[PDB]
């Protein structure tokens, strides 16, 4: 099948709702910048960004639309164009934060559909997003 | 947190129960061998294997105990010793096969606890297990 999902899940010592608000509004362990716009539904609900970035040494671009759901503490990043779309027909990244039954569990999911069987699965992106949330989490404390 | 999980999930065009039986009883895109024993509860329920294998060029060993649950089509591989335990206090690999709401969805989950913050997350194992189930799946058809 061309269809799959990669996940990295990490425990964080931080209340879920506060951690979601931190991630929602938040650096450069990678060369990167973006231009773009915010989206409203007159309050900002999301954004559309064109990113320029370097992954594993290679410069790339991507157009990303981000939406959020405060009730479920979920952020959704929907990629519509760029280098990744040479490999994937569909590429979405869903970030979920839930309390432990303390602190919380953060899940990054990359939901993808390959263009064909020769396409790689997005382990490079999984590692990138993983190291990004590890770094962010290591700059927060009690 | 030192605690996390990595997942790779793939769709396969194959009934779930049959695919589980295939995985349960099943090669060498990696240098590897094992010695070990089978476990009974007088019917074999599992196995305990000492593996010798090469991952990303480096020879390694691991002691693995495998159990299965036919009712949930789940295989559990519990690592008790070897090279990975220099990095992880706990390392388990859970393989689940479920029908799509056709064919099925296979999930490999690596549930880990790092020894300390300097330990890597097991992306190397995730890619290995991923490429192994992709290869196996590509030798099955209608
Ligand atoms: C091709 O895949 C992507 C490429 C870039 C992004 C951009 C992005 N979104 C959220 C957080 C990010 C965090 C980043 O690091 C700070 C970053 O640098 C490239 C890009 C980020 C998202 C992507 O997937 C949603
Ligand atoms: C350190 O982690 C492991 C190392 C080796 C294994 C051994 C193993 N179990 C199941 C399927 C396997 C499939 C393999 O490839 C055919 C293989 O080669 C190293 C080892 C396998 C399992 C492991 O985790 C469960």
Author numbering:
A (entry chain A), B (entry chain A): 8 to 33, 37 to 51, 54 to 113, 116 to 156
The authors write:
The contiguous latex includes an abundance of related proteins belonging to the pathogenesis-related (PR)10 family known collectively as major latex proteins (MLPs) and representing at least 35% of the total cellular protein content. Members of the pathogenesis-related (PR)10 family, also known as Bet v 1 or major latex proteins (MLPs), belong to the wider ‘StARkin’ lipid-transfer protein (LTP) classification with diverse physiological roles in plants, including sterol trafficking, lipid ‘sensor’ activity, and modulation of transcription factor function. Using a combination of sucrose density-gradient fractionation-coupled proteomics, differential scanning fluorimetry, isothermal titration calorimetry, and X-ray crystallography, we show that the major latex proteins are a family of alkaloid-binding proteins that display altered conformation in the presence of certain ligands. Seven antiparallel β-strands cradle the C-terminal α-helix with the alkaloid binding pocket located in a hydrophobic pocket between the central C-terminal α-helix and the β-sheet.
E76 hydrogen bonds directly with the isoquinoline moiety amine of papaverine and noscapine, and through a water molecule for (S)-tetrahydropapaverine. Alkaloid binding leads to the ordering of β2 completing the Bet v 1-fold. Alkaloid binding and subsequent ordering of the β2 strand causes C59 to be buried. Noscapine and papaverine showed the strongest binding affinity to all tested MLP/PR10 proteins in ANS-displacement assays with IC50 values from 4 to 126 μM and 42 to 493 μM, respectively. Notably, whereas ITC results suggested that a single MLP/PR10 protein binding-site could be occupied by two alkaloid ligand molecules, crystallography data showed that PR10 −10 bound only a single ligand. The size and flexibility of the binding pocket do not exclude the possibility that two alkaloids could potentially be accommodated. Crystallography and ITC results support a 1:1 and 2:1 binding ratio, respectively, which is insufficient to accommodate the direct binding of all accumulating BIA molecules. Our discovery of structural features unique to alkaloid-bound complexes, including S-S bonding, inform future studies regarding the nature and possible contributions of specific MLP/PR10 protein domains and quaternary structures.
